[PDB]
UniProtKB/Swiss-Prot annotation, chain A:
This is DNA-directed RNA polymerase II subunit RPB11. The lineage of its organism: Eukaryota, Metazoa, Chordata, Craniata, Vertebrata. GO terms for molecular function: DNA binding; DNA-directed RNA polymerase activity; protein dimerization activity. The gene is POLR2J. Keywords: Acetylation, DNA-directed RNA polymerase, Nucleus, Transcription. Gene3D superfamilies: RNA polymerase, RBP11-like subunit. Disulfide bonds: none annotated. It holds the Pfam family RNA_pol_L_2. It comes from Bos taurus. Its main location: nucleus. Component of the RNA polymerase II (Pol II) core complex consisting of 12 subunits: a ten-subunit catalytic core composed of POLR2A/RPB1, POLR2B/RPB2, POLR2C/RPB3, POLR2I/RPB9, POLR2J/RPB11, POLR2E/RPABC1, POLR2F/RPABC2, POLR2H/RPABC3, POLR2K/RPABC4 and POLR2L/RPABC5 and a mobile stalk composed of two subunits POLR2D/RPB4 and POLR2G/RPB7, protruding from the core and functioning primarily in transcription initiation. Part of Pol II(G) complex, in which Pol II core associates with an additional subunit POLR2M; unlike conventional Pol II, Pol II(G) functions as a transcriptional repressor.
From Swiss-Prot, chain B:
It comes from Bos taurus. SMART domains: RPOL8c. GO terms for molecular function: DNA-directed RNA polymerase activity; single-stranded DNA binding. This is DNA-directed RNA polymerases I, II, and III subunit RPABC3. DNA-dependent RNA polymerase catalyzes the transcription of DNA into RNA using the four ribonucleoside triphosphates as substrates. Common component of RNA polymerases I, II and III which synthesize ribosomal RNA precursors, mRNA precursors and many functional non-coding RNAs, and small RNAs, such as 5S rRNA and tRNAs, respectively. It comes from the Eukaryota.
Curated annotation (Swiss-Prot), chain C:
The tandem heptapeptide repeats in the C-terminal domain (CTD) can be highly phosphorylated. The phosphorylation activates Pol II. Phosphorylation occurs mainly at residues 'Ser-2' and 'Ser-5' of the heptapeptide repeat and is mediated, at least, by CDK7 and CDK9. POLR2A associated with DNA is specifically phosphorylated at 'Ser-5' of the CTD by CDK7, promoting transcription initiation by triggering dissociation from DNA. Phosphorylated at 'Ser-2', Ser-5' and 'Ser-7' of the CTD by CDK9 (P-TEFb complex), promoting transcription elongation. This is DNA-directed RNA polymerase II subunit RPB1. The C-terminal domain (CTD) serves as a platform for assembly of factors that regulate transcription initiation, elongation, termination and mRNA processing. The trigger loop allows entry of NTPs into the active site, switching between an open and closed state with each NTP addition cycle. The gene is POLR2A. It is found in: Nucleus; Cytoplasm; Chromosome. Catalytic core component of RNA polymerase II (Pol II), a DNA-dependent RNA polymerase which synthesizes mRNA precursors and many functional non-coding RNAs using the four ribonucleoside triphosphates as substrates. Pol II-mediated transcription cycle proceeds through transcription initiation, transcription elongation and transcription termination stages. RNA-dependent RNA polymerase that catalyzes the extension of a non-coding RNA (ncRNA) at the 3'-end using the four ribonucleoside triphosphates as substrates. An internal ncRNA sequence near the 3'-end serves as a template in a single-round Pol II-mediated RNA polymerization reaction. May decrease the stability of ncRNAs that repress Pol II-mediated gene transcription.
């Protein structure tokens, strides 16, 4: 009766924004990113990539409730560097790694079959 | 400076009562030229220690080699001051008790400073003259380095 | 009976003991996560206990951030023997019993039913009597 | 004997005085007589309260239920004001009384 439809976990409805940017006023150079209709599949990669950056002092994510689909990411970086730049660089590096991985897997398939 | 204490120790026991914890062992060291007993808990997985070892112990109120304090806030992107990175094992604690050998009238001749490194305790007995740098609730670093 | 009527129940309670053992050393990323789940957190990551050869925090070092205000308390673990309080090592406690909280920091000890439970004078009772309902509520939620 | 030793405030030995109370206060304590009379009257009141307690509580049970936790308040005061226990203090026992 009160069952939400299955597509509500990945479909943005009328009005919902994918990502909203808010600042953190407790500590300087901190920022919070709220992502709607996402889960650990993206949160974990983005966090682990942010931690590789030597100019990132804090990088975490959490899902506030398992029944409500929303991801919150918090990143604080050293001065003369902004968390938005850290986030964008992280996404770019992830895309580059995935593209290289796909290329190498395709060549490995080609070597394995008929070779 | 900021170095409250500095001496070379020798390990006499690792667990006189028994292996209480999997990854933590309690050294029972004795000094040399100071006659100061030590009881220190050391993470043995990260920093293995066995019997008969000699290490140089330094207890300093700051790590920055100039005098300024650290405020206790962690920051790894601060290699500029060139902290005391000549040691192998470094811990960070807070002295929580200074027992003594006082009485009603006579003053103390032997002290005993306890420091808690976030769970891993330490007691450092000895004479009351070279143990004067310790005041309770004060943050303290510990630095170890095994001598070959 | 002038005791706290609610306390930690059996699953945070079976796990806070394991968290507060001496052996628990936490990596940088694990500390990041756990602090991400703290609602009353200032925003400053404390200095690790073990600083070399690899930065490691400790379970007590994070339960200290959970504990509110400046609470002073002394409890006793449920496996504390009858000789530690008498013989030597009174304040050294080889088995890590004799919980001590000074200035809102878990200096030593293992937390169990006798510290976070629904008994008189427990840590939660002291937190209530000292800080109020509005802070004890956050205490419960953050612990869990 | 234990009660007297623990609650008497010997003002005669004067070495414990120099060790525990400050120098400007120990001279005042050793010079005044009204201070000494008040300090003796305090112990008299404590002895009478001890007898009243022993009448109220036979079978010697110390455990009791009271509204203010004085020992924990004292601990909080010590930690709040950064009191160092190894040094003589500036608290006048007459001010305490």
């Amino acid at each position: 009766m009160n069952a939400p439809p299955a597509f509500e976990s990945f479909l943005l409805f009328e009005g919902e924004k994918k990502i909203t940017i808010n600042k953190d006023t407790k500590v300087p150079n901190a920022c919070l990113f709220t992502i709607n209709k996402e889960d650990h599949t993206l949160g974990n990669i983005i966090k682990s990539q942010l931690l590789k950056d030597p100019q990132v002092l804090f990088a975490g994510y959490k899902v506030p409730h398992p029944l409500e689909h929303k991801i919150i990411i918090r990143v604080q970086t050293t001065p003369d560097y902004s968390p938005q730049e850290a986030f964008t660089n992280a996404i770019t590096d992830l895309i580059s790694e995935l593209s290289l991985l796909e290329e190498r897997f395709r060549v490995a398939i080609k070597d394995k079959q008929e070779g | 400076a900021g170095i409250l204490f500095e001496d070379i120790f020798d390990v006499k026991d690792i667990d006189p009562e028994g292996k209480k914890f999997d990854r933590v062992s309690r050294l029972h060291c004795e000094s040399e030229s100071f006659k100061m007993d030590l009881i220190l808990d050391v993470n043995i997985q990260i920093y293995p220690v066995d019997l008969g070892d000699k290490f140089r112990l330094v207890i300093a109120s700051t790590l920055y080699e100039d005098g300024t304090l650290d405020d206790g806030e962690y920051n790894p992107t601060d290699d500029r001051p060139s902290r005391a990175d000549q040691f192998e094992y470094v811990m960070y604690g807070k002295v929580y008790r200074i027992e003594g050998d006082e009485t009603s009238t006579e003053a103390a001749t032997r002290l005993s400073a306890y420091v808690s490194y976030g769970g891993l305790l330490m007691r450092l007995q000895g004479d009351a003259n070279n143990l004067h740098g310790f005041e309770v609730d004060s943050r303290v670093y510990l630095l170890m380095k095994k001598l070959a | 009976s002038n005791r706290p009527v609610m306390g930690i129940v059996q699953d945070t309670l079976t796990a806070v003991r394991k968290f507060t053992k001496r052996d628990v050393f936490l990596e940088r990323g694990e500390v990041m996560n756990l602090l991400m789940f703290l609602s009353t957190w200032d925003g400053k990551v404390p200095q690790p206990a073990i600083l070399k050869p690899r930065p490691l925090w400790t379970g007590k070092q994070i339960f200290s951030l959970i504990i509110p205000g400046h609470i002073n308390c002394i409890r006793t673990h449920s496996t504390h023997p009858d000789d530690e309080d008498s013989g030597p090592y009174k304040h050294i406690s080889p088995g890590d019993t004799k919980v001590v909280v000074e200035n809102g920091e878990l200096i030593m000890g293992i937390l169990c039913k006798k510290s976070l439970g629904t008994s008189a004078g427990s840590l939660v009772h002291i937190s209530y009597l000292e800080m109020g309902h509005d802070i004890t509520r956050l205490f419960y939620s953050n612990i869990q | 004997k234990a009660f007297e030793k623990k609650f008497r405030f010997d003002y005669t030995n004067e070495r414990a005085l120099r060790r525990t109370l400050q120098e400007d206060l120990v001279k005042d304590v050793l010079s005044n007589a009204h201070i000494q009379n008040e300090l003796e009257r305090e112990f008299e009141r404590m002895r009478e309260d001890r007898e009243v307690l022993r009448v109220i509580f036979p079978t010697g049970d110390s455990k009791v239920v009271l509204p203010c936790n004085l020992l924990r308040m004292i601990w909080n005061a010590q930690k709040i004001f950064h009191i160092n226990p190894r040094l003589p203090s500036d608290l006048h026992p007459i001010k305490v009384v």
